[PDB]
Amino acid sequence: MNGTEGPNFYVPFSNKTGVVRSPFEAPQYYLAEPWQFSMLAAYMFLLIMLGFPINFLTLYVTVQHKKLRTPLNYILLNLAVADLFMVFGGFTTTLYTSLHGYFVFGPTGCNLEGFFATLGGEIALWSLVVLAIERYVVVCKPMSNFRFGENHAIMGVAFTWVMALACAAPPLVGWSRYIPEGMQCSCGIDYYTPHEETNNESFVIYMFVVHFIIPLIVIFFCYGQLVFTVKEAAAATTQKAEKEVTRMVIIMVIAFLICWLPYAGVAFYIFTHQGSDFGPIFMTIPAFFAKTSAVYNPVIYIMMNKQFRNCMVTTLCCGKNPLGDSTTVSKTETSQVAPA
Ligand SMILES: *[C@@H]1O[C@H](CO)[C@@H](O[C@@H]2O[C@H](CO)[C@@H](O[C@H]3O[C@H](CO)[C@@H](O)[C@H](O)[C@@H]3O)[C@H](O)[C@H]2NC(C)=O)[C@H](O)[C@H]1NC(C)=O
Ligand SMILES: *[C@@H]1O[C@H](CO)[C@@H](O[C@@H]2O[C@H](CO)[C@@H](O)[C@H](O)[C@H]2NC(C)=O)[C@H](O)[C@H]1NC(C)=O
Ligand SMILES: CCCCCCCCCO[C@@H]1O[C@H](CO)[C@@H](O)[C@H](O)[C@H]1O
Ligand SMILES: CCCCCCCCCO[C@@H]1O[C@H](CO)[C@@H](O)[C@H](O)[C@H]1O
Ligand SMILES: CCCCCCCCCO[C@@H]1O[C@H](CO)[C@@H](O)[C@H](O)[C@H]1O
Ligand SMILES: CCCCCCCCCO[C@@H]1O[C@H](CO)[C@@H](O)[C@H](O)[C@H]1O
Ligand SMILES: CCCCCCCCCO[C@@H]1O[C@H](CO)[C@@H](O)[C@H](O)[C@H]1O
Ligand SMILES: *C/C=C(C)/C=C\C=C(C)\C=C\C1=C(C)CCCC1(C)C
Ligand SMILES: *C(=O)CCCCCCCCCCCCCCC
Ligand SMILES: *C(=O)CCCCCCCCCCCCCCC
Ligand SMILES: [Hg+2]
Ligand SMILES: [Hg+2]
Ligand SMILES: [Hg+2]
Ligand SMILES: [Zn+2]
Ligand SMILES: [Zn+2]
Ligand SMILES: [Zn+2]
Ligand SMILES: [Zn+2]
Description:
Residues 325-340 are annotated as: Interaction with SAG. This is Rhodopsin. The chain crosses the membrane at residues 37-61, 74-96, 111-133, 153-173, 203-224, 248-269, 282-303. Residues 1-36, 97-110, 174-202, 270-281 are extracellular. By secondary structure, the chain is mainly alpha-helical. The chain has one domain (1-340): Rhodopsin 7-helix transmembrane proteins (Rhopdopsin 7-helix transmembrane proteins, Up-down Bundle). The protein has nine helices and four strands; from the N terminus they run E-E-H-H-H-H-E-E-H-H-H-H-H. A two-stranded antiparallel sheet has the order 1-2. The chain has a two-stranded antiparallel sheet with strand order 3-4. Helix 2 packs antiparallel against helix 3 (106-140), helix 3 (106-140) packs antiparallel against helix 6 (239-271) and helix 6 packs antiparallel against helix 7. The longest helix is centred in the middle third of the chain and has 35 residues, at 106-140. It binds a molecule of 3 linked components (NAG-NAG-MAN), a molecule of 2 linked components (NAG-NAG), nonyl beta-D-glucopyranoside (5 copies), retinal, palmitic acid (2 copies), mercury (II) ion (3 copies) and 1 more. One nonyl beta-D-glucopyranoside (BNG) binds at residues 261-262, 265-266, 269, 278, 282. The site of one mercury (II) ion (HG) has 6 residues, from helix 3 and helix 5.
């Protein structure tokens, strides 16, 4: 056997030498060198070191500025939270797992590590659909009289959590399971083994379709529609606001792909080539790189959203003067209203 199937795992190493041992009981320093694990640990450390402040700042800004309530703002507050969950929930176990060379915290660590990462990634994807739509509406303006409100915005957010849980929760209660991957320092869905007793084959197919293919079709298609009204370029007069948001949304989507296709692909590969000969590094990279998903979103947001940015610059300066080049939102100052 090219691998080493446990009743709990599958080390992509061969135990014709007895050196293979549970990623739940002892260091996997036989799969790779003790420094590569240190690198992982370093990286993860940096990720936590960054995913925390960025996602938190975003949180504090969004709420502290009472007018920042557009769907987009909602979605992003959402992502900021899901990102924070990743950070403490799983990133902590993954940093640790790396530090020790295996899941010292047992299958729970594997679960915290795998779950929150999937919970985080899916919320990201599903939010992307909520946006795709919100966008399609505000640009192709379907209803004669319409403009999303916080009431709908909260709907979409609640929805992304349901859809996300719909994907990430099952492996915790019987459908498929979270299992260490690569150098056994992160945990993902079981593609490696058939394990009739947990129905991996079915869930994986389920996830790839319901929680990957479909949303993508939806998002891509909705894009194919808005490739007419808000065609592509950038720089009423309100036209220039929505068209700039879209551009961001679009980027966000590309950003998502770069962060997940390499992984999703490696995952799909394995699923359809279980027992074949792949090593530990084969998954560690797309899997850990993928972990940037807990942080890139806010960056796009602060870089491509002139309103939020200046709002952050505002909070950061505890007062004003946000070095920009247009409406507002804040607290004591003029976060007053202007409806109709
Ligand atoms: C790869 O093959 C190895 C042997 O061919 C095998 O190692 C075996 O590991 C077990 C640990 O569970 C050792 O047994 C020990 O069991 C209990 C732990 O629950 C200890 O308290 C006892 O002291 C006992 O020694 C075996 O000694 C060891 N087999 C050997 C070297 O003879 C690996 O588990 C195999 N890799 C896999 C499939 O994970
Ligand atoms: C062990 O791993 C090797 C490497 O993949 C597997 O060998 C492949 O076998 C398939 C059919 O069994 C051939 O079509 C390929 O040419 C072989 N190499 C590949 C996939 O590139 C072997 O089957 C694996 N044995 C198992 C299932 O444990
Ligand atoms: C695309 C940018 C155009 C902004 C339109 C999106 C609506 C979200 C912000 O609206 C404002 O929210 C305040 C608190 O929620 C209300 O007090 C105020 O009356 C309302 O106008
Ligand atoms: C984090 C993900 C990185 C985002 C990807 C950035 C690529 C977007 C810029 O592309 C360019 O945009 C112009 C205006 O639309 C087009 O005229 C041009 O042909 C196209 O090449
Ligand atoms: C990690 C996220 C950073 C990637 C940047 C995405 C590439 C798209 C750049 O488009 C430009 O962005 C400017 C933001 O200032 C807008 O003013 C301008 O109109 C728009 O055309
Ligand atoms: C969409 C981007 C994601 C990339 C997709 C990852 C699949 C690439 C893996 O290829 C396989 O690697 C094995 C070695 O491990 C070879 O033995 C095998 O012949 C080769 O076919
Ligand atoms: C995506 C890139 C494709 C690479 C995936 C295959 C993993 C190759 C690394 O294997 C490891 O190399 C060490 C040094 O030789 C050995 O000590 C160790 O036992 C072995 O497991
Ligand atoms: C740090 C640990 C990781 C990478 C664990 C789990 C990740 C997944 C099970 C990924 C699932 C998917 C996402 C988030 C993006 C769309 C495709 C997907 C279903 C493969
Ligand atoms: C305004 O008074 C002048 C600008 C000074 C503020 C800029 C300082 C950099 C802020 C870094 C962001 C870290 C936030 C930490 C969140 C936990
Ligand atoms: C409102 O909340 C206060 C405004 C923020 C004050 C700006 C402080 C930035 C930190 C600058 C420190 C200079 C670096 C010196 C190296 C020791
Ligand atoms: Hg769209
Ligand atoms: Hg990324
Ligand atoms: Hg602002
Ligand atoms: Zn899902
Ligand atoms: Zn299978
Ligand atoms: Zn990837
Ligand atoms: Zn500016």
